[PDB]
Design a protein around this ligand. Sequence first.
Ligand code: PLP
Length: 226
Amino acid sequence: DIAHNLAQVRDKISAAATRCGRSPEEITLLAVSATKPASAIAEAIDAGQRQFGENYVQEGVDKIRHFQELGVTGLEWHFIGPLQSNKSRLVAEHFDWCHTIDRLRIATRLNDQRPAELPPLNVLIQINISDENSKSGIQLAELDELAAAVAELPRLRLRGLMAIPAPESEYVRQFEVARQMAVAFAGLKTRYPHIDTLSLGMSDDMEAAIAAGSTMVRIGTAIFGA
Ligand SMILES: Cc1ncc(COP(=O)(O)O)c(C=O)c1O
């Protein structure tokens, strides 16, 4: 039951925020609807969910067109998958957020392809904080340079950081890795304008990420099933 699962997930978010002295409103729930049908999204919308994350461009754009066509207003779509240059125009024309900026050329393409009448595309720079197997994300040492370049792109808005840590079962390591991101986020936030988003945490490490300072958790399985 999607409605029931949304309520249950929001309950555990709220508790984890309150337990570590944070307001529940500090945490945005991003419902990851990738691989799920539009009808499952429509259920979530009827249950009050408004922010959806998609991993594949054409799948996401098709859904966005579907709900725009029903005149369903007020949604926020986040592209959270790796972005190839040949699909950037579709992202730039349809999505509200992109979490996976890890090279300047893809950001400049998105900026150039973003219609001027739209709001600037909110972007996060993706950090490979702990996954030796992943091709995605930059090293932290590259952050200052990339953030500076991205920040001048007028049709993008740099909002913060994202990371997909390597899978980790120990709470202690989940926390310390998320803290590495939170420290980097805080340092960016002191010099850059409108840094307010740390996209960090999924179903299995949600509590450590929230304790560490995440502002946005990306939940799929716990809402829609795997
Ligand atoms: C970036 C990102 N966030 C979240 C998820 C899903 O998280 P979970 O199903 O563990 O809640 C995935 C896709 O599986 C993902 O690629």
